[PDB]
Amino acid sequence: SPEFMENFQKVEKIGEGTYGVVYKARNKLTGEVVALKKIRTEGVPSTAIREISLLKELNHPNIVKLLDVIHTENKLYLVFEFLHQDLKKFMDASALTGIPLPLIKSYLFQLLQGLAFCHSHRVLHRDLKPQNLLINTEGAIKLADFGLARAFGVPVRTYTHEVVTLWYRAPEILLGCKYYSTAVDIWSLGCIFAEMVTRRALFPGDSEIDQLFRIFRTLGTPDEVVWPGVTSMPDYKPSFPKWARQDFSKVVPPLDEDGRSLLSQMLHYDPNKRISAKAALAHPFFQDVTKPVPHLRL
Ligand SMILES: O=S(=O)(O)c1cccc2cccc(Nc3ccccc3)c12
Ligand SMILES: O=S(=O)(O)c1cccc2cccc(Nc3ccccc3)c12
Ligand SMILES: O=S(=O)(O)c1cccc2cccc(Nc3ccccc3)c12
Numbered sequence: 001s002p003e004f005m006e007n008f009q010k011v012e013k014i015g016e017g018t019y020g021v022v023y024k025a026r027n028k029l030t031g032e033v034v035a036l037k038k039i040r041t042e043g044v045p046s047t048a049i050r051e052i053s054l055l056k057e058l059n060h061p062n063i064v065k066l067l068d069v070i071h072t073e074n075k076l077y078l079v080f081e082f083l084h085q086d087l088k089k090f091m092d093a094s095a096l097t098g099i100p101l102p103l104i105k106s107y108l109f110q111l112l113q114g115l116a117f118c119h120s121h122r123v124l125h126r127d128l129k130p131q132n133l134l135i136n137t138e139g140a141i142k143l144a145d146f147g148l149a150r151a152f153g154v155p156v157r158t159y160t161h162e163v164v165t166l167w168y169r170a171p172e173i174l175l176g177c178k179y180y181s182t183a184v185d186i187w188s189l190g191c192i193f194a195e196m197v198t199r200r201a202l203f204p205g206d207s208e209i210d211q212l213f214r215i216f217r218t219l220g221t222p223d224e225v226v227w228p229g230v231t232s233m234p235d236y237k238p239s240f241p242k243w244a245r246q247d248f249s250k251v252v253p254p255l256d257e258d259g260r261s262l263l264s265q266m267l268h269y270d271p272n273k274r275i276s277a278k279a280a281l282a283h284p285f286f287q288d289v290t291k292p293v294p295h296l297r298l
Helices: 046-057 087-093 101-120 183-198 208-219 257-266 277-281
Strands: 008-016 021-027 033-039 066-072 075-081 133-135 141-143
Touching: 008 033, 087 133, 087 183, 101 133, 101 141, 101 183, 101 277, 183 257, 183 277, 257 277
Parallel strands: none
Antiparallel strands: 008 021, 021 033, 033 075, 066 075, 133 141
């Protein structure tokens, strides 16, 4: 202390965070491997600093641990605990068989615990996706690559106007809701739940309107009965096609009534009816939840 970038030997690139590249590095002084995320861009809004401070305050088993923050010439290096496996990579490695239900249950349960914690502390993730959910050898899964309400740094990814971060975006956001809620995270997680089960992304759209239509084609085009206020949302258009809701026996074939009940509550159109992370933890689907260790080729 202080830690200096020169104190770290870079080992290998681990991944591509939305706001910075992440490298596996070794602390030359302690031998401890860590994960370093470099963030590169002037001003930083007061609201920005406050949200970052709130996130930094969080200490939870299911949120990747930030160990230090090193400042150096317009650069910022976030020193995190080292992890190098994520749900996306894991699901792909397990594509020709799928993740075992016990592990699906465990991961979903843990993500809900992490989210419940964030939400009670006024913190939202806003950009949940398989790629940013890190897993370790002992079976934990952790939230990472948090999104941002107000910018200040630099977005290093590309997915933006592409075909990825949109796949998990809540409909209220796509329809132009200015003030959204913690419900947007539950929606993303519900999409991830379906994905772990079917082994395919639930709504892989390529544009905001395409994302909306894919959602509509599956859950039915929402109306005032199902979602009070929907027809007055900023970007709602009466010209939207009207699709009927599909049965979950078709949408997520492998799930039973308990799984379907939980998924339906996580994908409820109305944010005011969508299950909270806290309430989801008490859902019967998690009665037999355990903490299985994943089989990784590490
Ligand atoms: O609050 S810090 O712990 O530094 C921090 C931690 C993690 C991410 C950050 C992103 C942008 C600005 C920061 N703050 C900042 C403040 C002053 C100068 C330069 C950057 C961030
Ligand atoms: O960038 S984040 O995910 O926010 C991240 C945050 C904190 C620690 C990380 C450690 C290794 C890899 C990451 N990223 C990563 C990138 C691409 C794929 C999988 C993981 C880490
Ligand atoms: O990297 S993340 O995995 O999101 C992350 C994970 C855990 C704690 C964090 C604390 C402050 C900032 C982060 N990220 C961040 C980076 C750049 C801009 C704004 C926030 C934190």
